[PDB]
Design an enzyme around this catalytic site. Structure first.
Site, PDB file in Angstrom:
ATOM      1  N   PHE A  25       0.831  -1.201   0.000  1.00 29.24           N
ATOM      2  CA  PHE A  25       0.000   0.000   0.000  1.00 29.24           C
ATOM      3  C   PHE A  25       0.868   1.254   0.000  1.00 29.24           C
ATOM      4  O   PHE A  25       1.666   1.471   0.919  1.00 29.24           O
ATOM      5  CB  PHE A  25      -0.948   0.004   1.201  1.00 29.24           C
ATOM      6  CG  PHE A  25      -2.014   1.057   1.124  1.00 29.24           C
ATOM      7  CD1 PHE A  25      -1.845   2.282   1.750  1.00 29.24           C
ATOM      8  CD2 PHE A  25      -3.188   0.823   0.417  1.00 29.24           C
ATOM      9  CE1 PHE A  25      -2.828   3.258   1.677  1.00 29.24           C
ATOM     10  CE2 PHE A  25      -4.176   1.790   0.339  1.00 29.24           C
ATOM     11  CZ  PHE A  25      -3.998   3.011   0.971  1.00 29.24           C
ATOM     12  N   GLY A  26       0.691   2.076  -1.035  1.00 27.28           N
ATOM     13  CA  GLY A  26       1.577   3.196  -1.310  1.00 27.28           C
ATOM     14  C   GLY A  26       2.841   2.651  -1.947  1.00 27.28           C
ATOM     15  O   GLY A  26       2.904   1.465  -2.273  1.00 27.28           O
ATOM     16  N   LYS A  27       3.845   3.501  -2.137  1.00 21.67           N
ATOM     17  CA  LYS A  27       5.156   3.029  -2.562  1.00 21.67           C
ATOM     18  C   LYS A  27       5.919   2.578  -1.323  1.00 21.67           C
ATOM     19  O   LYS A  27       6.369   3.407  -0.523  1.00 21.67           O
ATOM     20  CB  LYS A  27       5.926   4.129  -3.295  1.00 21.67           C
ATOM     21  N   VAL A  28       6.045   1.265  -1.154  1.00 23.63           N
ATOM     22  CA  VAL A  28       6.725   0.712   0.016  1.00 23.63           C
ATOM     23  C   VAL A  28       8.181   0.363  -0.285  1.00 23.63           C
ATOM     24  O   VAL A  28       8.479  -0.468  -1.147  1.00 23.63           O
ATOM     25  CB  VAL A  28       5.985  -0.514   0.585  1.00 23.63           C
ATOM     26  CG1 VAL A  28       6.801  -1.156   1.696  1.00 23.63           C
ATOM     27  CG2 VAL A  28       4.614  -0.101   1.094  1.00 23.63           C
TER      28      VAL A  28
ATOM     29  N   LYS B 101       6.789   4.046   3.781  1.00 30.12           N
ATOM     30  CA  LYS B 101       5.572   3.950   3.007  1.00 30.12           C
ATOM     31  C   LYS B 101       5.305   5.351   2.483  1.00 30.12           C
ATOM     32  O   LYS B 101       4.816   6.217   3.207  1.00 30.12           O
ATOM     33  CB  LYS B 101       4.427   3.457   3.898  1.00 30.12           C
ATOM     34  CG  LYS B 101       3.077   3.378   3.202  1.00 30.12           C
ATOM     35  CD  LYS B 101       1.979   2.986   4.186  1.00 30.12           C
ATOM     36  CE  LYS B 101       2.085   1.522   4.578  1.00 30.12           C
ATOM     37  NZ  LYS B 101       1.523   0.611   3.534  1.00 30.12           N
TER      38      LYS B 101
ATOM     39  N   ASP C  44      -9.034  -4.578  10.381  1.00 31.80           N
ATOM     40  CA  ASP C  44      -8.506  -5.373   9.277  1.00 31.80           C
ATOM     41  C   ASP C  44      -7.339  -6.247   9.716  1.00 31.80           C
ATOM     42  O   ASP C  44      -6.287  -6.283   9.066  1.00 31.80           O
ATOM     43  CB  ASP C  44      -8.105  -4.479   8.086  1.00 31.80           C
ATOM     44  CG  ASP C  44      -7.986  -5.253   6.784  1.00 31.80           C
ATOM     45  OD1 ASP C  44      -7.349  -4.713   5.851  1.00 31.80           O
ATOM     46  OD2 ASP C  44      -8.534  -6.379   6.679  1.00 31.80           O
TER      47      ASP C  44
HETATM   48  C1  LIG Z   1       0.446   1.255  16.207  1.00 33.83           C
HETATM   49  C2  LIG Z   1       0.108   0.805  14.784  1.00 33.83           C
HETATM   50  N1  LIG Z   1       0.772   1.674  13.834  1.00 33.83           N
HETATM   51  C3  LIG Z   1       1.027   1.256  12.600  1.00 33.83           C
HETATM   52  O1  LIG Z   1       0.506   0.244  12.156  1.00 33.83           O
HETATM   53  C4  LIG Z   1       1.982   2.007  11.725  1.00 33.83           C
HETATM   54  C5  LIG Z   1       3.043   2.817  12.180  1.00 33.83           C
HETATM   55  C6  LIG Z   1       3.717   3.320  11.080  1.00 33.83           C
HETATM   56  C7  LIG Z   1       2.997   2.782  10.025  1.00 33.83           C
HETATM   57  C8  LIG Z   1       3.288   2.976   8.731  1.00 33.83           C
HETATM   58  N2  LIG Z   1       3.594   3.113   7.613  1.00 33.83           N
HETATM   59  N3  LIG Z   1       1.986   1.994  10.378  1.00 33.83           N
HETATM   60  C9  LIG Z   1       1.065   1.301   9.425  1.00 33.83           C
HETATM   61  C10 LIG Z   1      -1.374   0.881  14.611  1.00 33.83           C
HETATM   62  C11 LIG Z   1      -1.993   2.117  14.517  1.00 33.83           C
HETATM   63  F1  LIG Z   1      -1.263   3.249  14.580  1.00 33.83           F
HETATM   64  C12 LIG Z   1      -3.373   2.187  14.377  1.00 33.83           C
HETATM   65  C13 LIG Z   1      -4.169   1.053  14.306  1.00 33.83           C
HETATM   66  C14 LIG Z   1      -3.557  -0.185  14.385  1.00 33.83           C
HETATM   67  C15 LIG Z   1      -2.174  -0.252  14.550  1.00 33.83           C
HETATM   68 CL1  LIG Z   1      -1.444  -1.869  14.638  1.00 33.83          CL
END
Ligand SMILES: C[C@H](NC(=O)c1ccc(C#N)n1C)c1c(F)cccc1Cl
Length: 261
Positions: free
Chosen positions: A13-16, A30, A123
Site C-alpha cells: 500500500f503506497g510506494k513501500v 511507506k 482489518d
Molecule cells: C500502532 C500501529 N501503527 C502502525 O501500524 C503504523 C506505524 C507506522 C505505520 C506505517 N507506515 N503503520 C502502518 C497501529 C496504529 F497506529 C493504528 C491502528 C492499528 C495499529 Cl497496529
C-alpha cells in the site's frame, strides 16, 4: 510529538521501500503520495500521525517518523526483518508448536493493548502481522484502515467478520477483530489461506454469512484441541458469543505456560 524526517535523511500500500536512514539504519518507508502540492492537508496529516504515535507497545509497530514535503508524503515505520506472518509460515523452514503458540500469545497481547486504548483494528489478517528476526511479532495497520487522512491523501475478505460482509455501513466493534483473530489461528496451523475450494467471491461471502467457516480438516499438521476450540469460539456468527481479548488471554496464557512455553 512525532519525529519529523526528511527524504535527504535517507540513503538507498503506497510506494513501500526498504530505506536506509543515514544515521539510524534500515526502516520501511511507506510513501503514500507524490504529486501536485497539497499543503492544505498538512495540519490534519501531522495531527493524525501524532495520534497514531501514541499507540506504543512491544507488540505493535512503531511510527519512526513522518516526511511532510512539498508534494511528497511518507510514513516511516520500523523494519520487520522476516516480513509478514503468511510469508513466515510459507518458507522452506518450520516452527515448533511452542513457537506458533508464542506468536498467538503475542498477537493476543497486541490486540489487548489496542482494545485497551479504545482502538479497533478492523482489518486484522496475516499481512498485518509482521515478524522480526527473532520470530517475535508486531501488529500493523499497513492498509492504513485507521490512518484516515493518510488513507485519503493516497483486499482479502477471508478474515472479515460476517456482519461486515455485504454491509459496509455497520460499525466495527472489538468482536470484529476477535473474528479476524479466529481465522488467523486457523491460518497459523494450516500454513495457507482458507477457502481454497470456494466456487467464487459472491457465493463464498453468502456461505460465510450463513455459517460456513475455514475447513478444520485442511489443517493437516497438529493443532492442539484447545486452539481448535478457541478458533471455533472466536468465529461464532453471533458477535456476542465471541470472547474479548482479555478473556482470550486469561484462558490462553496458562495453556501456553502449562503446555507450550
Ligand atoms: C500502532 C500501529 N501503527 C502502525 O501500524 C503504523 C506505524 C507506522 C505505520 C506505517 N507506515 N503503520 C502502518 C497501529 C496504529 F497506529 C493504528 C491502528 C492499528 C495499529 Cl497496529
Amino acid at each position: 510529538n512525532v519525529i519529523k524526517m526528511k527524504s535527504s535523511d535517507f540513503l538507498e500500500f503506497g510506494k513501500v521501500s526498504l530505506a536506509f536512514h543515514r544515521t539510524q539504519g534500515l526502516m520501511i518507508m511507506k510513501t503514500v503520495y507524490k504529486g501536485p502540492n497539497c499543503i492544505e492537508h498538512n495540519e490534519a496529516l501531522l495531527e493524525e500521525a501524532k495520534m497514531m504515535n501514541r499507540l506504543r507497545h512491544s507488540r505493535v509497530v512503531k511510527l519512526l517518523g513522518v516526511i511532510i514535503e512539498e508534494g511528497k508524503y511518507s510514513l516511516v515505520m520500523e523494519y520487520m526483518e522476516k516480513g509478514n506472518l503468511m510469508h513466515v509460515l510459507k518458507a522452506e523452514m518450520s516452527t515448533p508448536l511452542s513457537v506458533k503458540g508464542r506468536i498467538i500469545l503475542e498477537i493476543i497481547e497486541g490486540m489487548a493493548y489496542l482494545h485497551g486504548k479504545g482502538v479497533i483494528h478492523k482489518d486484522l489478517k496475516p499481512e498485518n502481522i509482521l515478524v522480526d528476526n527473532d520470530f517475535h511479532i508486531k501488529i500493523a495497520d499497513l492498509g492504513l484502515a485507521s490512518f484516515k487522512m493518510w488513507s485519503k491523501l493516497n483486499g482479502t475478505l477471508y478474515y472479515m467478520a460476517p456482519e461486515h460482509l455485504n454491509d459496509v455501513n455497520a460499525k466495527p466493534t472489538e468482536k470484529s477483530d476477535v473474528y479476524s483473530f479466529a481465522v488467523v489461528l486457523w491460518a497459523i496451523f494450516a500454513n495457507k489461506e482458507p477457502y481454497e475450494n470456494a466456487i467464487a467471491e459472491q457465493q463464498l461471502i453468502m456461505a460465510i454469512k450463513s455459517g460456513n467457516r475455514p475447513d478444520v480438516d485442511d489443517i493437516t499438521e497438529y493443532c492442539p484441541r484447545e486452539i481448535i476450540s478457541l478458533m471455533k469460539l472466536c468465529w461464532e456468527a453471533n458477535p456476542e458469543a465471541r470472547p474479548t481479548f482479555p478473556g482470550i488471554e486469561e484462558k490462553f496464557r496458562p495453556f501456553y505456560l502449562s503446555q507450550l512455553e
